[PDB]
Design a binder for this molecule. Sequence first.
Ligand code: SF4
Length: 74
Amino acid sequence: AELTCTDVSGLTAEEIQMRESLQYTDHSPYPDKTCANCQLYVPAESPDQCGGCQLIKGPIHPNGYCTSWVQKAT
Ligand code: SF4
């Protein structure tokens, strides 16, 4: 199975609510906007693990997205 980053069981209800507010998804709807090209992403320690985010808590997929995506590209 591919890497999934939707296990929110270590988060508080309020932290989950923020993630939902921002429409976090593992599968970005946009070809050109993913967590991996967002300024707030923190890459994983292995490509076989989820990364993280400075803005929302919990596991974060590099192919994912939320509506607060902050462009890296100059
Ligand atoms: S701010 Fe949103 S798009 Fe950027 S890394 Fe975090 S979850 Fe992904």
